[model samples]
Every structure is written in structure tokens, then in C-alpha cells.
Target: AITTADNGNLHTWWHDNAVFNTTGPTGNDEVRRSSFYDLQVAQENQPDKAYDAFTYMSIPRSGKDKIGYTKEDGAEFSSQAGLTMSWSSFEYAKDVWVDVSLRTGQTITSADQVQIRPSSYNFEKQLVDADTVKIKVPYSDAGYRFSVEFEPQLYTAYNDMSGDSGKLTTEAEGNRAIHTEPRNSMMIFAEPKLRGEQKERLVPTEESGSIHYPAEGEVTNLNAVTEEIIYFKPGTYSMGSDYHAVLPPNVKWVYLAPGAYVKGAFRFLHDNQSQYKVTGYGVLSGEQYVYEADTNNNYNHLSGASNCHSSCVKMLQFASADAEQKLDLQGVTVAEPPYHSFVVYGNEQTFHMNVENYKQVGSWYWQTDGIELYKGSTMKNTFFNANDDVLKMYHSDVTIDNTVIWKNENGPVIQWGWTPRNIDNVNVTNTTVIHNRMYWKDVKYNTCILNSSSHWEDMGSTTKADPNTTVKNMRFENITVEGMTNCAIRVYALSDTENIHVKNLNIDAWNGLDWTSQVSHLKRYTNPAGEKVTIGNEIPDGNGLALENYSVGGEVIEKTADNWADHQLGRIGFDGENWNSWNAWRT
Candidate 1:
């Protein structure tokens, strides 16, 4: 632990690299994290002189359940001496947060609204008198909000580390943590303007990046390290029709300077695009795109696989299919949906992705759904204001954990299932689905974690309606929600044409029976041809889980008809030591 003093203010810090537990589809699991730090600050008992406090932290790409932070709750509390800030963390998939709560004892006579003079990206800000001054920024939104409540005479925000190239407050101060590098600067920064910087320097050059864009017709991506903060010197770059580029099959790391902007999409899909990464403290945009991305035409589409010859011309297809195992994306911003914002169509196989501190905004009316992980994993990625399912998984063994999915419409927030070929093994955990615009409430649906066997059948004549289009072995844990115009989950199970049989379902960590305005747990509609199936509805020897509605209409779905472990809320727990280490946790 260490404490530092400056102008009557005291900052105390300590850290923890501990062991924790969380449940998996199987049972109890253990999680050994590297190291996390904390800070306890006071105005040095200076109530008469009000001041703001900030805390900067980082998020590792190996993160899933612990990606973000508690954006809602007592993130900041006040004492007479000042606000004693403390956060109750490890809830669901989390994010990094910075709160500048002001303390008031007899501070300056200025009763003012919070003020944030950021030295970097522009973030979203919110304020409350007394001890509440909150500012939240999605990973890709690219900036931090400055906040304060009691209101001090001097400004409380600063962008003092242009020399540090956008590191967290902790990292900027000669970041000594073992886990750091320009490629994965997962650190989140928080701190009041120091006495020296506050006394001198005006906003500190705003930490600007090189204002470079790809040429009118060019592709730029040709790229890391254990721990260096490197910036792309300002310049203009461009790409051909697809604003694209390809990394060497062995290329493991790449970064785009936050100041660099390109007009096309970037795909990481080489025969061996595995264990690779492309990230930055900047942005990647599709505003200048010439085509609708993430559409039917974009089939087999990626940065490299522009053409595939399936005829006898090819030697032999995937006799040795390449495995897409690891990918990392962080500290960046992506905008404009191109067919789909981010797409990964890895073949019938397994994939894992680590994403964090990135932001995506704007509507993608034509094709760009926020992020679609087809048979893969994308965790800790944040999104807002999108046109379709913000984060989606098309098939089996996929996970989207602890991310900010907000303001989406025309589709479900965290969508899964709808997979045909014996689809199963889907995991979507700790997601925040707050403030969805409710585009399809008329269709009895909106933003939600949707899992099912057949995803198509508005009575549509697709193979998915074959009831035999089954999905199983899927789980949703640590579900933290804010708003829903309909059921918390939209499920599919049992029967033909629509005889969909969704077997082996898992639902836990949600406290049902307590939706503020009469809400149901699931819309579970499977009343096709008088379906009779049993599986999770409380059967020691029970199997064919069924209810009257099976699959009903208009918000009148049954909450829980049987005592199935999978159907009960809190049947398993989240946001707790017991839940994280479900199997063999001791204390």
C-alpha cells in the first residue's frame, strides 16, 4: 500500500491479485486473476476546500466476467470530510468506471453543477448534487467525462499525459504493473488534476493524435509488444474499395493510431488469423463505405477471404480446417455498421475472442448489426444506438460476457440460438440491456437475451421452421437489466415446422417475480401440434419440460410451472462468492 500527499490532499492505494470463483455450464469453477488495485482518498479532511477525486484502472483482455464495472449503485459515497468513494465490484461482466464525487463540509461558497474538462475523448456525463457525479464512456466512444458535485472554484479535470499516450491514471504515473503494453492498455484512468498540473498547464494540449486518413484508394493494416505505448505519427492513409488490409498469417499484433481514420471495414480472418489482435486509443469508421456490410452478399466476407473457389479447382477443402482460437480488441472506437459492425463466420468449430474498452455508435440500417459472433466469443465490448441485435451469436459454444449493450432497437439485445445443425453450447453472461428503444414490441419482442432452436418462422418457409432445428446446452448467468418492454427472455422449445424442440436449457442469477410493472420471465411459445415434451421443468426423473402456453401470446406467459433447476431464478447465484466458484469454493 502507498499514500501520497499534494496540497493538503491524501491519496492512499493498495492492490489485490486474488482467487475467485464463478459457475460454468458444468458447475463451480475457479478464477485466478492477476492483480487489481484500489484507492482511498480524502480532501485531507478539507471540507472547507472542495475538490474532485478520480480513479483510473485497467481491464485485461483475458477478462470475461470482470470486463466492466458497476455503473449503477453506490459508486461514490460522501462523508462530512468529503465523499469517501468505494465501489462494490465483481458483479456480472463488468466495465472500468471513473467517478469524481465531491465532498462538502464548508468548502467554497460555490454551489455548482459538476464540471469535467477532459484532456482526451469526449465522454457522456451525468451529475447529482451532494455525492453523485457520474460519467460513463463506452469503450469505443473514445474519451472520459469530467464530473464534480459540490463544485470547486478551480476546474477538476485534466488531460495531462500526452507523453503517456492515453494510459490510465495509474499507468501514467510510471505504470509499474506487470501486465501492460501498447497492444493491450486495458487500463481505465481516474484522478483529479494534480496540484502541479492544476496550478500550471492549461488543459495540456488535449492529448491529440495524428490526423491521418488512408488514401482515396488504399488499404492500411500491416502490424506489438509486452508493454509499450506507441502512437501512429499523424498522416493520411486510405484503402481500395473495402478500406481493408491483411496482416501476415503469423502477424500477432497491430494497432491503429486513434488519430487515424479509414473508410472501410477491417476483418481478421486469415487461414491462421488465430491468436491475433488489432486495437488502439483511436477509431475505425464505415461512414465512407460504398456497400451494405453484414448482408447476404457479404457471405464468406472478411479482410482477406474475398474469394473462395469451392469447385474441383481447390486441392481439397479444410481436410485440415484452421482453428480460430484467440483474438483481442481493445481501447478503441468503431462506428457505422458495415453489413455488420464486426463479423466472424468461423466454420463448424470453436473460437475465443477478448474485446474491451471499445465503443460503437450510430445506426446501421442496412446491415451492420453492432457485433455478430458466429460460432465464436466476444467479451467486454460496449455498444449503443444501433439498428439491430447489438451483440449476437448465431450458433454453438459462443459467449458474450460483461459488456455495455444499450439503446438498440429492431431486435433483441443479446441474441443467440436460431442455429440449425444440432446447434448448442451457447453462453451469454453478465450483459446490461438497459434503454432499448422497443422497436418490435408490437411483434412481442425487444432487446433481450434470446435463445432458441429455430430463429426463423414468422411462419416463414425456411429450414429453421423444421422443429427439428434444435439448440441445446445454452446458459445465461448474471443477468443485470435496466429496461424491457416485454419478457426478460424469448425462448423456443419442442415440435415440427414450428415443432421446435429446444432441449437442455439453463437460466439462473435472475430474481424473477419482481419486475416493477408486471413482467414475465420468458415468452416460451411452443404450442405447435399439441407438443408434449419434458426436460427442465422440475423432474428428478422429469425431462419433457412443458407448460400451457408452451409458446403463448401477448405478455401472458407462465412464470414457472415446474420446479426445474434451470427455470428457477436464483436457482444458482451471480454477484457473489458462492456463484463465481460454484463447484469447490471455500470461503
Candidate 2:
């Protein structure tokens, strides 16, 4: 059932984390319940034809914690002498992986470093002691090749607590949550091997189509999928109003193998006539990350109607309909959906959304906001622990290298807004962010990088606004704010777009200084009780702004309003007071 046994390029599955042990996230107590730890899948050579296939991930933490390999038919898996390696090789110019192993008796704790789920580059390991440890797994884009070869026995047996509150739950998003790590190269339990253009080469056959379980009635076109290849076997499947599916102009692909659980809502309602693909390594849990209901929500579609059991897969668009539109979700796993997982608004009709080795969890907290490529470039494969704004592009032509900016309250993990119009070629590279703009919930925006034209989205009402609109050829490179508590960047135009670019920047600001006008355009001004005040004349043409090789507040400060030892609690690099030595990676 793992791609019908006869795979290619490499693929493996072991999902069905029992529907994320019941929806996901909560007060917590070692993940509330449920377990899938006994996961097993195999393959060592013969991928494509075989030239490099060292696949072997025999993870087993829960369900008792005991696993071995080298056998099949009866189930053994391979890499037997205590598996957990990935250090074979693959640096691909700092894309990471110079080390990854966990052999010698396996009893490591205190997290961070060594992981490859949706991989957003947090894998920076330490503890070269106890049985050898040194794992680094970062990546610079190239569609799937990641593995779950983890060594972080965080709470042992994969519990919650982000290794004790470094605050990132629902591990790498949600459902079947990429448990115990696994990546691709002819492998086991782990998954990773997507090629590109959405790349979802499924080749399964058992009857392949129309197997959606739960209840059956007006599936409403179900997106028309019928080129066969639609195996949704596993468990927990339900449906109702939100199935709107239709992919069958010749059906490209659709697979939900390894314990897939789809509640409702998955709209791939495209009209491009042909071109459709849906990858596997399943878990489409939806319904806003799940609410009560133990099993997929009885396939809900009515009652209270919270997104009707939300779960989305929309590549929907059609100005008059072009022919090629792809939606390859390569190795998927998501939770909840109400807005922006991948939704476009650019009408010139552009949609070829892709996600290689995906994962997105616990969304919809007031206004779900991750990956909103409002145009042709629908990308931002958010890897883990997000609630809002992992990415929010406007207008179009975009690029956001690597992920970060997790739930800093609302906006700015990476944002470049300017609506109704205003948006010209954007790019953001190798990210790592954390901004918490609240400004009374209705106004104020704070963060490390942005060019927001104004209007707090009509928040509360009015607080003297202006979205004059204009953002010219935006770009921010190599980025790593790590901790920018504001006064870093937030460009505003006033009118008629211009230009804006920031390069190689690295910051740690809050008030240490590197005021490239705060990187230019940062405005506020207003102390009339309307209270705003910040100042830096709203980007008056300044060539619009190009600011290169940027950097701010690298450390060194002892001057403050009332100086409390000159605050600089350092989060990312840890100097403020060893954050549990920092669990699961940094800051």
C-alpha cells in the first residue's frame, strides 16, 4: 500500500497518527492519548533503479519502545542495529545534514537539532556527548528529500510540551504529525522525495477511485477526480457540504494512503480543464485542527457549521480557464482551514501551488493566516507550529526562502501587503522571524520586515489611516531577525509606489541600533491623543529605498529609559539565561 509496492524516485509511508491523537493541542499531558509509534515501512535499494538508497528509519518510542529490522513479510523494517541515522552525507551547500544519528542505547533528551518534517531549518543539534550526537538538517529548496531521522526524545515517546515550552506544538503542523522522523531515499516510515512542479507521482492500484469513507450522499462533484489513482484507505473519512472536488479532465493524481482522515472541505475546484495532482503520506484532519468528536467529526456538514468540518485543498481559479494548473501537495498533512493555506486573488489566472514534504497545524485562531500567496506564486510551505502569518504575499511574483515567524500574535513572520493594487515583484530569503504587532488589536503593526500600505484592515473602525498604496520591487535577503521586538522595519508609501530592497540583513534589535532609518520607511507620527508617534518621514522617494547587506543590533547595550541592567534578553543566540539550554533547536 506504500505507493502500491512498486515505487519510483523513492516514496514511503507510515502515517495515521490516529488523527493526531484526537484533533490536537490542549492543556497537554504527554499528548492526551493515542499512539502510532509502532510505525514501520521499508526499502533499501531499487529506487528508480538504485544508485543510492540507504533507507532505514526504525523509530519506536511509544507503544512500548522496541523495534528491530531487516525482515519483511512478517515485518522487520531494516537498519536493524538500532536505527536513527541520516548522516550519510548531503550538505548541498549548507542545506544541512553533516550529522544525524542516535544509536548507542538511545536515551537523549533536551531538544533542538535533528529533524526533517516539512523541514523549516531549525535542525541545529548539539550534545556531541552520550552515544554521539551532531545533527544539522537545513534545506534551501528542492522538493522533498527530507527524513524523520530524529534524535530528540523530547518527552520520550513523542509527547507534547515543545520539549518543555519553547512553545511550538502540534509538531510540524498536525495530524500523523510526521512522527519520529523519516525522510526519502528509498525508505521507511519517513517520507520525502518530491521532484518539483508540485511533483506527486502516485502509481497505486486497488480500485483507486471513489473510496472516501464516512457517509455517502451528495458528494457534490467531489472535484470530479477520476483518472483513477485515488486511494484514501486508512480510516476516519467523512464528508458533507465541503467536498466540492472535481479533478478529472484527465485526472493527474490523488492519493491518501497510510491512515488518511479527511473530515470535510477540500476544494480543488479548478476549471483549467486538466492538470490535477494530490500527493500522499496522509492526514488531512481539518475542522480547524479538530474539535471534540473523537473521529473525524462524524463527517459533519451542518450544526453550528464551523467551516463545516474544515479542511482545504484549493487551487481554484479560472479567468476563462487556461489548461495547465497544478496542485501537487507532495507529502501532505494539515489541520484546519478558513483562509490562506493557499488561496489566490490575482485573477490573471495563475495557480500551480506546491508543497513538498508538508505539515501545518493548529490554525484558525481568530483569522488563520499562513501562505496567502494572493497571486500566481502560491508558496510558503510552512513546516511547523504556526497560528498566523508565516507568509502573506500580495499582488504577486513572490519568493520566501525557508520558514519562521511563528504566531507573533498576528502579523509579520513575513508580510508585504498593499491591496486593491500596489505590489511589484517580491522576495524574502532564508528566514527566521518573530514579530508581535498588536497595537490595540485594531491598529499598530510591528516586525522586522514589511511595506504595509496602511488601513489596519478596517480594524475597529478608524484611527486616522492611509493606505495610499505603493510597494516597488520589494526584496529582503538572507534574513534572520531572530528577535525584532519592533522598530526594525514596516515601510509605508504615502502614494504612487517606488522601490524597496534590503539585503543580507541579520538583526537582533529592540533597541541596540543599526538604524538604516530602521531599514527605511518606518512611520507613525501622531501624539495628539490619537497616540501613534514613532517617526521617520514615510519614505519620501529615497530612491524608494534599496538598503543593502543589512544588519541591526548585533549585541552590546547598556543605555535605557530607566536601565534595568539595559535589557536585551536575547532569544535566538541565548545569552539572556540559557533557555533550558534551549529545547528543540534555538530561540
Candidate 3:
């Protein structure tokens, strides 16, 4: 059940699964019969990016049809899914054991047949009789998000809708139940409902301001509401063809009621008011702006030469004016964001941001980053299926826990210092990379998990803290990679990066790098600015780029310099602090 099941520990929203096959996917036809009939079918039509007749003009990224990316012509389509999901809360003693049950349409097979990505998490899988599978997951208070991979892939293939087109799908039928590609798997998030007291604290009261539920097709702005909360009722709230929604200075809390959907971008400001929060099980989507002719070209839209940096829009952006008021975002499913999904712009602010049970999906564009946190932030129980940097961290002192990533293309799971900041003390623990489909030759350090660069001239360092960034004290523990298109781990000696430790790093599969060519280039290099920048596998501290326990293909890597070399870790910046001193060389 996708909605309205609050059995104490567990909660399920009604419309969480409604947006699955409505738009974007190759298989736009074929409706399967199930017991879960559409709830309030007439009132529950969530407007996607392609919704035009409900069109009105406001602010612009050049709205839908004029942008021409939302063409209904026969061509390549995005991957999507049509699957049944049920969530319930189960409180067990000691460790929090998450029990997930699945009923596949196909008959039961081996455990590998009905697989789960990020199997690296401590979990027990069992085939229940013939068609059922039971998974006992490990503990997390915020709950975990996992993807199930079964026969014939999950979503529609990327290139064609036909079965015999060699486009990666084996099912020879025209209409298959919405599934994802092996690259882009379907997600199942199980998050607990808010506690009673927690709900009461967030409930809108007379003193806390009134509640406003803007009707569908309504173009209402809430900038003047000094202290009210906006609750999007279970229906489509449209901004017509415009792509922007209002979250003004006075509105401190925004709730997307279960089954609620908004076809507009809500940008939170740094107006320096009280604490601001957005928590709900509703879907905030940018389906209108998801259309693009050339896959990677940002300028080739219907509206002339608009670039990614200045043109594309972010779905959820929270800016802090260096205030003590904290910003918290929890239990929201963001889909097909035009650019980055969640962006936090508080550089060196004392305010700490907390994000939990936050899920983002269908980021197919180049700069569609998952979450960007500046300083003093914590993200837990999140899933990011983004095309760009998943955790685009700028400043330091951040903690990431129980996060799952599916990097589409062009970005790393952790990309630090793109805008040049002295990054340190970032701990990412209990992380899982479900799939990373990047194979770009343009940037060498764009690896599966972490990539750090201090390219001052390239990334533009005018707003950055340092010209040459110093990155250190970054610890990543209990990291697991299910699959990748390139190297699993790749770091750099640029930016004085050091003291980076990785523990319990397990990789199932990856396209190993061309170690011969990479090792040769690591010798030395000169840059365009006449600075002799040496790209070496060494760090300033003796323990830079340390790997405590790691494995590839289920085989543990020994803690030896030569053994590390055999695995290409030493050649690709896994030098000092692993098994030996990272005292080889530096710029």
C-alpha cells in the first residue's frame, strides 16, 4: 500500500506510488489490475511537467512546451517503474530489524534471482516458498531505503521500447509492468512515521499561525503569511505552466499531506526568521522541465542558449542567512528534479541542517546533483538516484549516515570542493552505492564514492574560502558498492587532500581503470597557469588516503604496498595511511 497506513511504527502515504508510470517512462501504456484501486481518482491527477492546458505564465526557465523537451514524438524515453510497495513499522528489541516482504509476479528462484542492491548491508535473505521473498534488514532509527532487482530488469530500457532492439531488456513484450533498467533500479523506502509528540510540535496552532491549503490550479503566494503552515492536501497543486512555487518569509512549516503532489519548485529563503521545516510523504516533482533534446547539452532547449549553471532550476533549495534557526527536511520523495534536488547554501553558518528519510529519484541531467550541504549538516536514511554529485559538500563538519546512492552519470557519490572550500571532518558512515553509470574521460577524479578537486580556475573560486583548499579528516566507514561503470574509489593529491580514511569498503563489480595509463600520468604535470601542479599519489600527512579494510569481488585486499599496487589502489591515490606512509610525492 502506498498510502494512509499508520499502524504505529510504520506509515505509508497514499499517492507515493501514483507518479510511477504517469509520465517520463518508455512504457506509457498498459495498466495492471490490483486491489489498490486509485484513491479519489478524479481529484488525484498530479500534474507533471507535460501538463500544459493548465498553463499560465510566471517566472521562467522557459516553461514546458516552449522548451520543446517535452515532445511526444517517438524517440528515446527515460527509465521508469510500475511496482507495488507496502510499508509498515515494526519495532523489535535490541537492533532495529527491518523485515521486508516481496511478492514477485514470477515464480520463486534462487536468492540471487530475486536480488537486492547494496547487499553489503547486514541482512538475511530467504526465498519464502515459491513466489515470496523475505528480507531481514539491519538497524537504523531513520529506516533504510533499498531497491529490489528481479528478472528482466526493473524499469523500461533507456533507448527503445521494443524488446528485440538490443536496448538491454529481455522481455519480448511491448507493454511490461513498469520496471527500471539494471542501471536505474526501482526504490523501496521504509521510513517510520513521526512520533505523536513530534507531530504535535509541528501541528499548526493559532499561536503558530493558521493552515492554508491552496486548491488545484491556484497560483497563490504565501510571502506575507508571517507564521502560518502550508499543508498541500491530497491533490495536485499546479502553478500552471510556471515552474516556481512560493515559500515566503512568514511560512515556517510546509507539509505535503499524504498523496499530495506539487508541480512546481519551492525555494526556501534565508530570510533569517525562526526555524523552517518541510516534512511529509508527498511528492514534489519537476516533470515539466525534464525534457531535453541532446542528453547532456543544457543549451539546446526550445529557449535558445540557456546553460546549466544559470538556466536549470533546483527543486528544493534552502538558504540560511547565518541564523541560529535550523532547517530540517524529512520524508519527502523528490522526482525528476530539473537540476540539483536538495541544495543548502549556508557557508560557515552556525545553523545545522538535518535531513532524514529523504528520497530523490530520476535525476537524468548532468548537473542534477542530489544533495548539497555546506557546513554542520547531517543526512540520514536517504536515497539519491542522481545524475550529478550525490553529496556535493562545500564546507566541513558534516555527518552522513545510512545513505544509498544510484549515480546516473557525470558525477560522483561524494564530490567535494567544486566551489573551493577548505573541507575537513566529514564522516560518511554506512553508505551504499546501488549503481554508478558514469564513464566520463573528461575528469579523472570522478570516481564511485568520493571525488575532491580544487580546480580554482575551472570551478571559479571568487566565492570560495581558499584558493588552494586543504581537505583532511574525512572518514568513510562501512561503504558498499553494488555496481559501477568505472573505478570504485579514486582520490587526488590536489588541494592538499590528506588524512582520508575508508573502512570496510566492499565493491561487488566495476569496470577497472586503465591502470597503466593512469599510473604514468600520476608522475607529474604542468598546468596552464604556469604552476607546476604534480598529480601524485601522496599526501602531506603520513596517513592520507588510508584504507583500513576493503575488498573487491569478495576478496579482501591485504595491507601491503605491493598488494595495494596489484589492486591499483596505490597507483590511484590510495597511498599513505592505508598500509604505508602516504609520503611518496605531492605538489
lDDT by residue for model 3 (225-254), tens: 544678777666654334465467667788
lDDT of each residue in 1-587, candidate 1, tens digit only:
23323342222221222232111111111112212222223342332233222222212111222112322111111011121111111100112333343322323332234343221234544443345443443432222212222333221111122332221122224331211111111123222222354222211122422222233224444321111112332222343333343333444444554334433454433555445555553445443333232122332132233422221011001111255566566545554433455544445465565665556643423233565554555555443435566666556567665554443335655554443344466666555443333322122333334433234434222233334444445555544343223234444333221112222122222221123211222323343454322223222212222222222112212334332223332121111211211121111
Clashes of each: 70, 24, 14
Residue 421 miss distance in model 1 (angstroms): 5.0
Residue 407 in model 2: lDDT: 37
Candidate 1 ranges with C-alpha deviation above 4 Å: 1-242, 246-252, 290-320, 364-366, 374-378, 421-425, 444-470, 494-536, 539-587
lDDT of 3: 0.52
Winner on lDDT between 1 and 3 is: 3
lDDT, model 2: 0.38
- Summarize candidate 2's per-residue lDDT along 215-294 as a digit string, tens digits: 22233455554444455664445443234354444444557654354544444444543445566656554442222111
**Against the correct fold, how does model 1 do in TM-score?**
0.47
What TM-scores do the predictions have?
Answer: 0.47, 0.29, 0.73
Task: Pick the winner on lDDT between candidates 1 and 2.
Answer: 2
Best first by lDDT, ranked: 3, 2, 1
Q: Alpha carbon lDDT of residue 23, candidate 1?
A: 19
